[PDB]
Write a protein that binds this ligand. Structure first.
Ligand SMILES: [K+]
Lengths: 317, 317, 317, 317, 168
């Protein structure tokens, strides 16, 4: 790989040792003339005069052209190899705050619209998935999400969060186990098809589990007659037509520390229905009137975009 | 992406600030000498004389070669990426009067022979379809005809007309709905397999619907005994052996405005059987003898190539 | 496609019209200086002296570098397109004495070992067939053997002979009909699976028909008890272990014109069993003793390589 | 392929014969000037003065640029062809001490972790296998392991050892027969699925046969109640948790030649259970107390990594 | 569908599916039904051997892991693979047997050094499994008990010579 460097150094030395070993001009001007001749710069300050000397000049010119040809050849081969290799995946990830996505479905396409295109890496192995991901605007890594060896290629260790949605619950569980084998602190978000596997996904190590099929089946099984819960669910979580479920935190101080919910009256002040207060990875749905707010708490509620703004400004210090 | 421009500007500045900061020749000739040295032009009008100066010349030459190498590398990488990307589709369309074709069957191959090869764009996603389209002489765009996002890549908004012929009537209806979601005025031409979907294609928004299977089934169901309607249909619409169904418009004035059909006697004058007169997106089959011709009307008839010429010249002003 | 030629001519003109329109040296030396400056040759005989003139030199150098970049870009794009296109087929054939092979099976692989690798063209459309053909040492053309349009890409018109062996007898018959539609004189060699299609292949236009399955089934149906005909067939036609069925023609004169078979006694003279004499596309198996030899006749017999040599030298003039 | 060399020699001759046939300077300086002009070196010592002469210089410059373009074109085409061809296999092997692997399964992936990545060559034909092998870190050769023609591409003749593990026992037997057809001395290591084919693999020519399915079935059929043999087998051969089955040879002399096992007491001295002594391709399990050690014998035993070290140092001279 | 096969009451369950993911899922499902049934699983990859044991498998078999290592050593020597094949796969001449110690057996409390099972019968004693643990190469101070299982390799003749020898 470094043989070409030795070859070109030999040619440069061979050239330099021609002037001094022929006309004996100067051991310093020979070094220069050899460098200007190879780079075709051709000043012409010091040109040969003997027939032997000018013949040696032709030999040096053709040898320099031959060396350049090999130089260009090596580079071109390297560029072709790199481009051909990194086009179909087979490239290690060097980032440290990306988002790794295992598998590609319609659920992972909808979360790509709220995430940066250059920070998400999709880890699959199908060929059509590569084209779909490239059209979507993400980066494709060729590997098996269930393999620990291919999980380190995607740099799961340093990822901000990992989203697991594979073709089957068995594969999802295996991928979660593999990720937890690498990093025990990375955040994992999984999707469950069957109701039986919701607890197994949580036991494997998933931080958050989503059950779209379980939600949709129950919504279908109640909308045959009434169809009012499904309407609320659709208009609040799917379309966000008018209202929206927001989660706004409480800043430092906020002039609302220690104030109870009964004295705050967030509904009567802003118009946002307070569902619960999440204090440190636990959701207290419908907190009592005796609950006291703190710093860093997150308020979960449903309201219009106007009322959400009315609340975020209201809880400011 | 523009780091190389800064690097080369730094090298040029570094070179220029060598003459003045070493030999102090001239702040204007230094700029020149640095440019002729990098482009290997090597005039030689102003060559260095000090050993330090000629060493700096070698340093500048090798640095310029290194900069050129990176320059060539970047370009080559860009060209490889562009060619590799636009070979398999994944390219947005910038035209504004093309013809978009969704799907690829034998029906869309026969309409390619009467259309310009460079104005038709085929929107599919199969790999064999790409080779078939390239052999036919059209442009291939990789996308799903049913997706509104992939429909905008083909630039349906600005297309002259869109031809929809997919693998199923469900896909055809979905594609028509998607196209009408983008543009409500573009002309859509669809093909229907089942007789039940002819009305659904028209309700979705298709301007023209063609039912080859419905026509062929009825032709088969009558040719068991007689086989005379099928012979006429084949020899007039499929082969155009002797006669042909032509639609010639009436130019401005044409010396035939207000003249009734009974007084015109187009059959007795030219020999072309007049089927109907299309006046503004409606076909009046067998117009009455009291019908009065106008300007911009289209005459639909069946005749030999000789009689068609005899009629087009007859209706001229 | 020729815009770059206009651009470079404009740059050359712009350069040439600088010397005369600035320093007014000579309308002939300006043309020269502009050509030596672009090709980085840089003699230096006529270098600028005014600051404006040397600035214009830098402008010309950078413009020439920009023009060269586009020049290299266009070429590279053309080469990439050509290589990428002619790698997967999609290339028209310009030869006029090649051998076209439709389909790829084990039968067409055994006939490749007795034919020149560079004269055979294989016309298929599967991807694995391309790799198999390339490993074998032939040229691959991507097309459908049943399509007349793709048959002209392989240049069947000018082919020496066409060998048809497709996946089914229906496809073989269709390909023969298509070839006969193009050229009514080219030689077609087909292979038949079923016994019912031997006559249909000959009616379609095939010059020679081979029935390996029909031969093998009958050989199997007789070797259950005796197995002596199959042994002869294998050892003479498949392996050519000891003997071989040869067909040697009769040269001009040959000192054997008009001599009857009874007076020639080819068996008693050389040891080759004379099966038949093919005189003008007809095989006379076991010719009578009254048959008279002629010029241009072909002798069909089975003999050892020694006896074949003994006969070819015997029938020489 | 060598036409370009003739073309460039013609251009060089044409250039050289310009000076002497025009200005008649010198038959030696013309050769030089032609070489410096083509390589754009442009010294300028001998520049033309006549208008005709300087026109001829422009003609030579443009002809040299045209020749260079073709030169670059040919090289680029060669590099593209080489890279495109050797990327998907289709490359002959020139090594003489590699390890050829036929087929790719989980068994051949585990033996890649104890072998050098650059000496193993995998011979398959599936496309996914190529990506798997490239990710693993080996070299991929595209061919059919059952074909003798594709077996010579992998250079089985000169291989150190061949490992055969295909999708079926029929394919494994066929590959072994093909390899033995090429080389009768190369070492073959095969894997058997069925118990019926263990003897057929040995009769075909396999030096060593492995039966993972046969071992696992019997281990399953005994672990239903006891499960103690399977525990030993797993912990000694699969995981090598604590102990390990080692095979250490006896060096020259070793101070243990002719010493009987009863007097050596290898178990009482080191702690390694002596299973057997392999003397020349035969395993003597549980050798008698009267057995006498020799030179070049291999000791097979199970022991901890400490006891193995205690034994290897003990048997040293 | 696991309850249709009546896994609850099964004597033992053998899990060998098309993939390690499916094997792990099946083991988890079986352990969800019955926490005491005996599960015997098979592992393809070396990474999943520990995950199968954590899921609840009582015994794990790694045929691919064994065969890969046997292939990776038989390129030059090929003596360990020969022993493994002839003892575990074909059982040509010898065989690895596991014979228990009956009640009393006239060998309770007798140390291995005083028993000398190799010098008496000819069977190489690999280890003694006392209650779901294998003591490979027990010390000379080990004392036999009742219900222990002796693991060794010997000919069918020597196995008979040992089973009759350890009888009361
Ligand atoms: K140059």
């Amino acid at each position: 790989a470094t043989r070409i460097l030795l070859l070109v150094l030999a040619v440069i030395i061979y050239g330099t040792a021609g002037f001094h070993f022929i006309e004996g001009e100067s051991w310093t001007v020979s070094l220069y003339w050899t460098f200007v001749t190879i780079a075709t710069v051709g000043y012409g300050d010091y040109s040969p005069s003997t027939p032997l000397g000018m013949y040696f000049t032709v030999t040096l010119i053709v040898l320099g052209i031959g060396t350049f040809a090999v130089l260009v050849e090596r580079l071109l081969e390297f560029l072709i190899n790199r481009e051909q290799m990194k086009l179909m995946g087979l490239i290690d990830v060097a980032k440290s705050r990306h988002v790794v996505i295992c598998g590609w479905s319609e659920s992972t396409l909808e979360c790509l619209r709220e995430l940066r295109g250059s920070e998400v890496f999709v880890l699959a192995e199908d060929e059509n998935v590569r084209k779909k991901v490239l059209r979507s605007g993400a980066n494709f890594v060729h590997g098996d999400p269930t393999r620990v060896s291919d999980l380190e290629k995607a740099n799961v260790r340093g990822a901000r969060a990992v989203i697991v949605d594979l073709e089957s619950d068995s594969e999802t569980i295996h991928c979660i186990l593999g990720i937890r084998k690498i990093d025990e602190s990375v955040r994992i978000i999984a999707e469950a098809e069957r109701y039986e596997n919701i607890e197994q996904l949580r036991m494997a190590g998933a931080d958050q589990v989503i059950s779209p099929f379980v939600i949709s089946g129950r919504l279908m099984s109640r909308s045959i007659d009434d169809g009012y819960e499904a309407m609320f669910v659709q208009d609040v979580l799917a379309e966000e037509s008018t209202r929206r479920m927001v989660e706004v935190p409480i800043p430092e101080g906020s002039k609302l520390e220690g104030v109870s919910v009964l004295d705050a009256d967030i509904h009567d002040v802003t118009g946002v229905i307070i569902i619960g207060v999440g204090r440190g990875d636990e959701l207290i749905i419908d907190p009592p009137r005796d609950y006291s707010f703190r710093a860093g708490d997150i308020i979960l509620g449903i309201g219009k975009p106007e009322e959400i703004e009315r609340l975020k400004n209201y809880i400011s210090a």
